[PDB]
Amino acid sequence: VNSFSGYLKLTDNVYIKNADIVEEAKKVKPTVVVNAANVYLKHGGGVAGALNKATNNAMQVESDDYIATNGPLKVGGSCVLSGHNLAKHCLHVVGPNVNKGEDIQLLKSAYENFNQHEVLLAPLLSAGIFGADPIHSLRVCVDTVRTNVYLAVFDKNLYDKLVSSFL
Numbered sequence: 001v002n003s004f005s006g007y008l009k010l011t012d013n014v015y016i017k018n019a020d021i022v023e024e025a026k027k028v029k030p031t032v033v034v035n036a037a038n039v040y041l042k043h044g045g046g047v048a049g050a051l052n053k054a055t056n057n058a059m060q061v062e063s064d065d066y067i068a069t070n071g072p073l074k075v076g077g078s079c080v081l082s083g084h085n086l087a088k089h090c091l092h093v094v095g096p097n098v099n100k101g102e103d104i105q106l107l108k109s110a111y112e113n114f115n116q117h118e119v120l121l122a123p124l125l126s127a128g129i130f131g132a133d134p135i136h137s138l139r140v141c142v143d144t145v146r147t148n149v150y151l152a153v154f155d156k157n158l159y160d161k162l163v164s165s166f167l
């Protein structure tokens, strides 16, 4: 049993809810919240800007030290950092950004990072300002992630479309 509430069940391991990932993290304090990161961990907008704002910029300070030591992530890659006031850990995952021309085939590689964690609160990747089709992102999620994932969809309109169209 876990603390996640109000999720509609899609598969054995994937759950979905119309939710503000920030508000959900604050309420649940999950072991892992996933950030929709870029390779520079520059948390300016979207899931990353909202998560970072909720940490009072501590996520950005920690991320800048990580990049100064390690250099940029790979598209499709991830790193584990603090969850600050939102979660135990934040898994920063880089999905391909269509609005920068990245290979959408890298979306499956991105979601494979989730399999290193038994339970996660996560947004869809490559959705929103990363420019991918969220219906596609949900299909790749279901077909890739084997661990238990709780998806927070920000848009009510999009949430209803993802559920209604789910195969």
Ligand SMILES: Cn1ccc2c(N)ncnc21
Binding pocket: 019, 020, 021, 022, 046, 047, 050, 123, 124, 127, 128, 152, 153, 154
């Ligand atoms: C996709 N996207 C963008 C903002 C956002 C949020 N606050 N929660 C979940 N997903 C989100």
